Copies of this chain bind each other. A is one copy, B any other.
């Protein structure tokens, strides 16, 4: 599992803000992870893959492209469902930036059931706050059936 090395190299490039190169190194790590024969034990490389996906998602976000990052984050969560709060966060935020608020809400709400609520929970709070903002505008737009009696 010397793929760790590659991740670290990518990690280096991440701090230098040259995120593209970090993406490439993370990607190489992933390929070195995914090209193992099917009959090799998979867990060792499992943890590493959750890490590689999460980190590549963050770099991708720094580049401002959300679909890729959401995908990567989701793969990270699929490789590690619990203990991986950052990945939950990143997919949530991506969904928010893609104006996909409801699904973001669902996602974070799930993540929190698993976990650290601090990062995630303010993220969630912010999500249903934004949601409130929309609901308000929707009412004003056309100007109450619930009170009405049939």
Residues on A facing B (Cβ under 8 Å): 10-11, 14-15, 51, 54-55, 58-59, 86, 89-90, 105, 109, 117, 119, 121-122, 124-125, 128-129, 131-133, 135-136, 139, 145-147, 149-150
Are B55 and A149 interface neighbours, CB within 8 A?
yes
Q: With A128-B129, A129-B128 in contact, do A121 and B136 touch (Cβ < 8 Å)?
A: yes
Cross-chain contact of A51 among B124, B131, B150 (Cβ < 8 A): B150
Given contacts A117-B139, A129-B131, 4 further A-B contacts (CB under 8 A): A105-B128, A121-B136, A124-B132, A125-B132
A14→B149 CA distance, assembly (Å): 8
A60 to B: closest C-beta gap in Å: 12
Residues of chain B with a CB closer than 8 A to A11's CB? 149-150
Are B136 and A125 interface neighbours, CB within 8 A?
yes
A106 to B: closest C-beta gap in Å: 10
